[PDB]
């Protein structure tokens, strides 16, 4: 059934350009400790990252954060096809621009603050049309790659010309904002989210499952707790992670 | 950044014609024990006072009351440029006129009651356009320097003839009433004002910063204590001192 088709799960290493798999699964795919892979997903999108063995990971699941996950247009519980891409050479000219909803207030040398310490001997592989997030200046600023000289994908070299027009581009409809609330934005609810997610995993990801079976899915979930942890943020994150509709009643 | 540009801070000396500086700062700026200095600020205006040594004052700050503060049309935190002006000589004849909304109820010889004891061997350096305040007779009367013979600036000597044409003037737009509230009109609330100020200082003085930075400022502040302490007085003082708008809800 092709062992190259894996299920996207939560990541442990919160770095952008990195995917995590189990070592025994890496023994099946003949992969190495740091090979530039190629991730294909729904709606025909590719993303290039680096493979690292995560011992706490299962064989069927693959770890990746929200930044990479959204580039593949996939949610937690989807299947993606991974294949090694060793034909990646160093880049020359890379056209990149920030999004207007993340630079809405700040200005100046964004490169010195965000770009430079992000590729300072990092050799991160980026493909045309990708959106990477760099956290600096006490906020979050996203960038979308316009065009790279070794199109479509290439590895950023220390001798790579980084073009920056200085024009805050717009965000598209299908381009979900990384600035929203996800499971990587809530803590102190380890035991809670596990119970919550396993109650809303299947009935929200596969409606055909519960309608073809006699299992009765839950209709109401009550959250106790003192005002502080963020019960509002929990339900909001679930709807933005599973892709379900979100309508709040204050 | 020019070591002659300082920041206006709260005053210990409530005298109208005094500007307090730190000891080492006057050594860097070459100022004497009574040299008439020239202050410049926003809205392109000038003012003349007398520099003194303040041990409780810091190097990068300068103490001055609301009189000098309003004459430069600046608030606590604005930038001003101080410079030595040794070409200021004694005055000859000075024509000054009071404001209509500060004499309503009293009449007679204003010169002998307010003016004469106020400039009584004080050598106060006034300038055309300055608005100083004299308190006495269980009230407060505001005067505006209309015209001085040694234009523009001169020192009021106890031999200087002081003319009073007796003609009430209109109130200009940017002329904040000195009868209103300020940080120097409230007491007993030392640590209270200390906490309150630094909570609403930044978001009120620079809204642009918080709209650009990813830092959340306090939205709602509650004031405890028994009635009669002056709850409303504190709030209105902040708005009047920061230039921010004020709308009360009884």
Structure-derived torsion over alpha carbons of residues B239, B242, B244, B246, reported in degrees to the nearest 10? 10
Query: What gap in Å lies between CA A53 and CA A57, rounded to an integer?
Result: 8
Query: Residue A104: closest CA among chain B residues belongs to which residue?
Result: B212
Question: How many C-alpha atoms does A246 have within 13 Å on its Cβ side?
Answer: 14
- For residues B142 and B170, is the Cβ–Cβ distance under 8 A? no
Distance CA B38, CA B88 (A): 10
Report how far residue A134's alpha carbon sits from residue A146's, in angstroms, rounded to the nearest whole number. 17
Eight-state DSSP code of residue A222:
-
3-state SS assignment for residue A4 = coil
Asked if B43 has any chain A CB less than 8 Å from its own CB, the reply is no
Spatial distance between the Cα atoms of B116 and B164, rounded to a whole number of angstroms: 11
Report in angstroms the alpha-carbon separations of A95 from A17, A92, A166, A226, B78. Answer: 18, 10, 11, 48, 41
Q: Which residues of B touch A133 (CB under 8 A)?
A: none
Cβ separation of B212 and A140 shorter than 8 Å?
A: no
User: Do residues A19 and A52 make contact, with C-beta atoms less than 8 angstroms apart?
Assistant: yes
Q: Residue A127 corresponds to which tokens in the numbers above? A: 């493909």
Q: Do B212 and A105 touch (CB under 8 A)?
A: yes
Collapse the DSSP code of A53 into the 3-class scheme (helix H, G, I; strand E, B; otherwise coil) and give the result: strand
d(CA B141, CA B135): 6
- Quick one: how far is CA A125 from the chain centroid? 15
- Euclidean distance between CA atoms A67 and B81, whole angstroms: 49
Measured CA to CA, the distance from residue A64 to residue A82 in angstroms comes to 12
Give the Cα separation of B142 and B137 in Å (integer): 13
Task: Tokens for B61, please give them.
Answer: 């700050």
Cis peptide, bond prior to residue B34, ω within 30 of zero: no
Bridge-partner residues for B122, per DSSP?
Answer: none
Contact A45, A71 (CB under 8 A): yes
Q: If DSSP codes are grouped into helix, strand and coil, which group holds residue B156?
A: strand
Degrees (nearest 5) of the Cα angle B24, B41, B73? 120
Strand order in the sheet with B161-164: B131-136, B139-148, B93-98, B161-164
Annotated ligand binding at A209? The verdict is: no
Length of chain A: 250
B213·A137 Cβ contact <8 A: yes
C-alpha angle B183-B185-B190 in degrees, rounded to nearest 5: 60
Q: B148 with B132: CB under 8 angstroms?
A: no
Mark yes or no for CB contact A140/B211 under 8 Å.
Answer: no
C-alpha distances out from residue A170 to A76, A142, A163, B22, B148, Å: 26, 11, 18, 52, 60
Among candidate residues B49, B51, B47, the one with its CA nearest the CA of residue B72: B47
Q: What residues of chain B lie within 8 A of the CB of A138, using their CB?
A: 213-215
Cα separation, A19 vs A11, whole angstroms = 8
- The string of DSSP letters for B84-149 reads E-TT--B--EEEEEEBGGGSTT--S-HIIIIIHHHSTTT-EEEETT-EEEEEETTEEEEEEEEEES
Residue among B248, B240, B242, B247 at smallest CA distance from B204: B242
> H helices of chain A, where?
23-28, 66-71, 110, 116-119, 190-205, 207-211, 231-241
Contact A223, A231 (CB under 8 A): yes
Whole-number Å distance between alpha carbons of B192 and B177: 25
Q: Exposed/middle/buried for A129, CB within 10 Å: 0-12, 13-18, 19+?
A: middle
Q: What is the largest CA-CA distance in chain A?
A: 61
Cβ contact (<8 Å) for A138 and B215? yes
Residue A214: strand pairing partners: none
Bridge partner residues of B157 (DSSP) = none
Residues A62, A68, A73: CA angle, nearest 5 degrees: 95
- If you measure CA to CA, which chain A residue comes closest to B212? A105
Give the separation between CA B39 and CA B74, rounded to whole angstroms.
11
B-chain CB neighbours of A104 within 8 Å are 211-212
Tokens read off for A43: 């709606």
B78/chain A closest Cα distance in angstroms? 22
Measure Cα distances from B226 to A125, B44, B184, B230 in Å: 65, 45, 22, 9
Contacts of B222 (CB under 8 A, 6+ apart): none
Contacts of A192 by beta carbon, 8 Å cutoff, 6+ apart: A234
SS3 A235: helix
Torsion sign, CA atoms A16, A18, A22, A28: positive
Smallest Cα–Cα separation from B19: which of B101, B110, B81, B73?
B81
């Amino acid at each position: 059934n092709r062992p190259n088709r894996l299920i996207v799960d939560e990541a442990i290493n919160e770095d952008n350009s990195v995917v995590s798999l189990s070592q025994p699964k890496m023994d099946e795919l003949q992969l190495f400790r740091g090979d530039t892979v190629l991730l294909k997903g729904k709606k025909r999108r590719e993303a290039v990252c680096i493979v690292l063995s995560d011992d706490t990971c299962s064989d069927e699941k693959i770890r990746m954060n929200r930044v990479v996950r959204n580039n593949l247009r996939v949610r937690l519980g989807d299947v993606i096809s991974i294949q090694p891409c060793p034909d990646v050479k160093y880049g020359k000219r890379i056209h990149v621009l920030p999004i207007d909803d993340t630079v809405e207030g700040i200005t100046g040398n964004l490169f010195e603050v965000y770009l430079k310490p992000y590729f300072l001997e990092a050799y991160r592989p980026i493909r045309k049309g990708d959106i990477f997030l760099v956290r600096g200046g006490m906020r979050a600023v996203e960038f979308k790659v316009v065009e790279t000289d070794p199109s479509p994908y290439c590895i950023v070299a220390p001798d790579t010309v980084i073009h920056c027009e200085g024009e805050p581009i717009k965000r598209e409809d299908e381009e979900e904002s990384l600035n929203e609330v996800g499971y990587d934005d809530i803590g102190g609810c380890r035991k809670q989210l596990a119970q919550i997610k396993e109650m809303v995993e299947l009935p929200l990801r596969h409606p055909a499952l519960f309608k073809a079976i006699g299992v009765k899915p839950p209709r109401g979930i009550l959250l106790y707790g003192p005002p502080g942890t963020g019960k509002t943020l929990i339900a909001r994150a679930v709807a933005n992670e599973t892709g379900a509709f979100f309508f709040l009643i204050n």
